[PDB]
Amino acid sequence: SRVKGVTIVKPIVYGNVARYFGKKREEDGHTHQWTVYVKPYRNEDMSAYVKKIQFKLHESYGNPLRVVTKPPYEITETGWGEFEIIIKIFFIDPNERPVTLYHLLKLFQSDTNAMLGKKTVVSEFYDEMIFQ
């Protein structure tokens, strides 16, 4: 006897891409450039149903609570260590509890890929968001 609406499912990908500079940036000792991101599994404007996404970077980043309101939902920074990003998705239709994803930022590649195409690391994962 629950009064439910229509079940609505939205498939998403999220993760990070990273690329090594070549040399230890002398000023901060940084080494990689990277973008963490959330994007639809197939091209569509998520802004129909996503108000904002926030990525909580590491405590060592200035302005660590980064937020994005309009697509692409991505944050680009540079760094030297791997750490755990906490990505919260905020829906438009309130009475829709946010979704929270933990993504371990990957910067270095596997020795297996040190032997094949060792340039650009990618770490992406599939998940789906439910509605109504």
Add this chain to the structure above:
Amino acid sequence: VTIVKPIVYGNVARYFGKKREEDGHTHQWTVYVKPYRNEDMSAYVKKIQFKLHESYGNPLRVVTKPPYEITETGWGEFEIIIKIFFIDPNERPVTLYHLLKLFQSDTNAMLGKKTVVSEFYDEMIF
């Protein structure tokens, strides 16, 4: 017999590599209508018009012969209304709207992609 005909539409764009100083243009793009499957549209489509932004000279571009597409160059993103007129005058024309997409995500920039694509699928029902 309710006959459906499926289509994709949208645009593709590519970065100059450097803003041209004559007109501050940074991209060339192409906006299009294509059939979902490699079939012929001309059998049932009189013309398609792509109403561009008023910044463009002659903003009402009309395509009557396939391929139903328009190639321009640009500095900015904007909405493109798309009017599909059918060959028997009875059939009501279908208006599609498309937000020209010109600027690459840092993600796709880091993956070394070279072409920005936003494309969409529809069904014209008869």
Add this chain to the structure above:
Amino acid sequence: GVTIVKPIVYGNVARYFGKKREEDGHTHQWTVYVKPYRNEDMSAYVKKIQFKLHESYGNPLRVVTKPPYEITETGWGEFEIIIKIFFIDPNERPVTLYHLLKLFQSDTNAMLGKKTVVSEFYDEMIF
């Protein structure tokens, strides 16, 4: 009659390592896939999807039941993957698609700066 239409894409992508990997000879990494065209839950209508990979692989009759309906491997040569699409509805007979796994880029796309082999083909599935 039901008469529902669900556009899908299938095919594979491929991105050549840079060099022959000294361990198993592998030169390319690839992903053969079947995706809805729109962003939607296709497990609403798809029970499972079988991918028949070349006999040289292991468990070559790969079967995916939860989206994404993607297989990822490495290899060094091309072959033909037979894709069988099993539906939720029992009255709906499975579809079988053939796809030639493209690993080698063509001269046209090589000369354009293209960095990934993409071979994508289209279909519409009816109910």
Add this chain to the structure above:
Amino acid sequence: TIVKPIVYGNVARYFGKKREEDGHTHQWTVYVKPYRNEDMSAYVKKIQFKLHESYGNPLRVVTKPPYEITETGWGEFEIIIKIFFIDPNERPVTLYHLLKLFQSDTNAMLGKKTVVSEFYDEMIFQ
């Protein structure tokens, strides 16, 4: 009553020098590919690209995708593409293509390094 749209053209790139060994200054690739990707090899028996007489083996035949031919040379000329069908009755379609190698002047200011000359067409059946 089947119509099949195709794209045909060439890409070329100035190689960077006048190769002194044989004079050849560009490398090009002429191709034919369906407007919307399908197994063209289901109904195309072979595709011919007849080229300038200076090229030994001037009739080149391709029989399976990618339907392209790659070469090097110094000058532009007309490539005759002939498309032969699996169905013995359907007669060969013949396309003419001005192979392009040198760039325009607004596309230099664009930030282009590769040339693209590409045309739509429709193979028609009964």
